[PDB]
């Protein structure tokens, strides 16, 4: 029959052979994360490798079914996925040595320590201790040291490897019929051959930048405001018209401005919406947390969790003797086995996380009907978007009343609302230029637009001009600060962090509207609306089966990305910022420096 009808059969053998082979890996991996052990570690590897070897084998096998000969969208997709040559397309040792680079980079990052320039016996690792300085300390110099040490002791180490990294990667990328490794990454957003819902690898760059422009006014003002507060905490270190010193930004790179909340709280006399000590008050436990999120979804017409979810999950740290990795992750194992691994503590933050992770599970349960290879978020940004959307609703002063955590008689004045929005803006709005700029540098570096000898020159040009942030110490090409960030030195597309942010709001504004919600968009909770349920679930059940443009269009009403909902959420922060900025300066100069003096 048609090589199509053939390829269908190939895929049908694959799906069964993989569904199983994955489940096995899955399960070993599971055994390990809950029970770290020599026996349990070794096992995780064995199953994991029969796996990647099965993938390699089936990849080389699908490589024999010619894509330019299929007229079924669905199977073309599955094949496309399978027949990615990847790192195989290189020479025996080119691929070998590349993996050598990628490996030590990952290591010297995770292993890298730094010691006091006066006390050589106290040596700090990035986690914790060092990022703890960078998140708490208000001592200008102490911070400057921590900022510089990282970028000097480890940046300079990563420089030569990142140098060779870009070469071999761009080689692989071009050999796969892409323009550069960057183009290879935007490929995730690509959709060809579906009239109307298509999207080209370039249509991203322009879309991102176009959307990013509309952020400026919001961002600029956030900037101006925090710029000003910061001056008060670091007297005489900051120019009321220049950029922000990179090392004063509350995390190590300045990706998030979360921790500057201490320093920038609008109305710091007003207290905190925090029910942690009132969950303990009604002697709540793990199961109550999850049973409650479970309610939250059953409330919008999604299903309960599986019996095997409640049977097979792990919602609490099981004390000592048996030690388990606590990172809140939600597991989609295969064979309708869904579960969560979370070291739940009776706390608001853990309560919210529980909603967020259980939101991943739901999406998983949704696209499960789908054939194996189509079981994923529409694009790299959909899953987490959905994750956050559940935190967003579950945190509103409204939800907390009904759930009997926040006291009925509590009122919500327009000042608490501003505090909360600013808390958000620090995290959500802070990181958007950071992310965009970060990725722009890479993209260009991959496009061959930034010469080796100006790598740190354009990096900091762009930080000053886009992000509005100045290096406290000048860096020559001896450093490699862009790669001092986990994602960059550990080979990771970073723009997903930008686009996920943008969707989550488009999803909410849509969901909230359909839930018939009255007030400001940030007070919205979708609880109890089966209507909001249906619309969400409508995209949710697709997985990768349709193009991310349709999946979007299934909930939002458009084929493309849109920054307006994200703005609409921060409207009453924006207006309020403009006032605070009344007698402040909005925008910055790229010429001022905290050292050139």
């Amino acid at each position: 029959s048609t090589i199509e009808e053939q390829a269908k059969t190939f895929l049908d053998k694959f799906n069964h052979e993989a569904e199983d082979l994955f489940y096995q890996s899955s399960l070993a991996s599971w055994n390990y994360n809950t029970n770290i052990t020599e026996e349990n570690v070794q096992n995780m590897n064995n199953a994991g490798d029969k796996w990647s070897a099965f993938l390699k084998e089936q990849s080389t096998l699908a490589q024999m079914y010619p894509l330019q000969e299929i007229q079924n969208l669905t199977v073309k997709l599955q094949l496309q996925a399978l027949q990615q040559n990847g790192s195989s397309v290189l020479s025996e040792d080119k691929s070998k040595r590349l993996n050598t680079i990628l490996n030590t980079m990952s290591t010297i990052y995770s292993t890298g320590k730094v010691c006091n320039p006066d006390n050589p016996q106290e040596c700090l690792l990035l986690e914790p201790g060092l990022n703890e300085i960078m998140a708490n300390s208000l001592d200008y110099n102490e911070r400057l040291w921590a900022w510089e040490s990282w970028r000097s002791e480890v940046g300079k180490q990563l420089r030569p490897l990142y140098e060779e990294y870009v070469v071999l990667k761009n080689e692989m990328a071009r050999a796969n019929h892409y323009e550069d490794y960057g183009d290879y990454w935007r490929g995730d957003y690509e959709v060809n051959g579906v009239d109307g819902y298509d999207y080209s690898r370039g249509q991203l760059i322009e879309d991102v930048e176009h959307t990013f422009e509309e952020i400026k006014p919001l961002y600029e003002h956030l900037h101006a405001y925090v710029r000003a507060k910061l001056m008060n905490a670091y007297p005489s270190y900051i120019s009321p018209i220049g950029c922000l010193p990179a090392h004063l930004l509350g995390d190590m790179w300045g990706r998030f401005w979360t921790n500057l909340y201490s320093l920038t709280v609008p109305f710091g006399q007003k207290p905190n919406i925090d029910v942690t000590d009132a969950m303990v008050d009604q002697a709540w436990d793990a199961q109550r947390i999850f049973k409650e999120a479970e309610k939250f979804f059953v409330s919008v017409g999604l299903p309960n969790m599986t019996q095997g979810f409640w049977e097979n999950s792990m919602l609490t740290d099981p004390g000592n003797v048996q030690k388990a990795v606590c990172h809140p992750t939600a597991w989609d194992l295969g064979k309708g086995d869904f579960r969560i691994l979370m070291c739940t503590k009776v706390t608001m933050d853990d309560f919210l996380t529980a909603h967020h992770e259980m939101g991943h599970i739901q999406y998983d349960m949704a696209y499960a009907a789908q054939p194996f290879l189509l079981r994923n978020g529409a694009n790299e940004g959909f899953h987490e978007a959905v994750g956050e959307i559940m935190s967003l609703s579950a945190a509103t002063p409204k939800h907390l009343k009904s759930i009997g955590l926040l006291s009925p008689d509590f009122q919500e004045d327009n000042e608490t609302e501003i505090n909360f929005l600013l808390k958000q803006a620090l995290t959500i709005v802070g990181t958007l230029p950071f992310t965009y700029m970060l990725e722009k540098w890479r993209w260009m570096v991959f496009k061959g637009e930034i010469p080796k000898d100006q790598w740190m020159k354009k990096w900091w040009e762009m930080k000053r001009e886009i992000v509005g942030v100045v290096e406290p110490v000048p860096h020559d090409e001896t450093y490699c600060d862009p790669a001092s960030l986990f994602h960059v030195s550990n080979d990771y597309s970073f723009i997903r962090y930008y686009t996920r942010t943008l969707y989550q709001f488009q999803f909410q504004e849509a969901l909230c509207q359909a839930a018939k919600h009255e007030g400001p968009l940030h007070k919205c909770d979708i609880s109890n609306s089966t209507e909001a349920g249906q619309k969400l679930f409508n995209m949710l059940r697709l997985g990768k089966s349709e193009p991310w443009t349709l999946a979007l269009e299934n909930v939002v009403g458009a084929k493309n990305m849109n920054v307006r909902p994200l703005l609409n959420y921060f409207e009453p922060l924006f207006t309020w910022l403009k006032d605070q900025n009344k007698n402040s300066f909005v925008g910055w100069s790229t010429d001022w420096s905290p050292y050139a003096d």
Binding site: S1, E5, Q6, T9, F10, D12, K13, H16, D20, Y23, Q24, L27, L61, M64, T306, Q307, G308, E311, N312, G334, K335, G336, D337, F338
Partner: protein
């Protein structure tokens, strides 16, 4: 009468190689099963009364595969392993057997067919294990486009209910 021999049996077959037990004359009352929340399906396609007085088909399938033991019905299991006639019928019973037919570790005893040049006629059986080629060719695996038509179900204790093992017993009337 010999029902305890049938669906009380220690050993149940694969779907593709299903078993048929010939029951004649023996006096039954049905109450042996009628009153029990031991079963999970028990949907009949003919009647459901009791007149004191027949074929019994036994095999094991996946949760999500029970749907397919009925007139009409979709694929794989209904298409290549066990087809039930559009008309003519009796009763279909099922029960979850995770406890017996699953090892936490994996039980790949049970198989089923996923490939055949041609759908089955009802009550037909295929026990043939020939490497399959979609162009009716001879086949010498692991050559490309060669496939063994039998797939191991793989019953882990922990999977979703739709993926746990169910014993099935079809009662036909003659």
């Amino acid at each position: 009468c010999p029902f305890g021999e049938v669906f009380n049996a220690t050993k149940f077959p694969s779907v593709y190689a299903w078993e048929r037990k010939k029951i004649s004359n023996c006096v039954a009352d049905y109450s042996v099963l009628y009153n029990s929340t031991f079963f999970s399906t028990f949907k009949c396609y003919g009647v459901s009364a009791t007149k004191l007085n027949v074929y019994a088909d036994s095999f094991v399938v996946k949760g999500d595969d029970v749907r397919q033991i009925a007139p009409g019905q979709t694929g794989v299991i209904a298409d290549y392993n066990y087809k039930l006639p559009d008309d003519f019928m009796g009763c279909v019973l099922a029960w979850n057997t995770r406890n017996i037919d699953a090892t936490s570790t994996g039980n790949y005893n049970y198989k089923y067919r996923y490939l055949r040049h041609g759908k089955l006629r009802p009550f037909e059986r295929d026990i043939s294990n020939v490497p399959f080629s979609p162009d009716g060719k001879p086949c010498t695996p692991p050559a490309l486009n060669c496939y063994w038509p039998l797939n191991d179900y793989g019953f882990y204790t922990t999977t979703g209910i739709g993926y746990q093992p169910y014993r099935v017993v079809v009662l036909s009337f003659e």
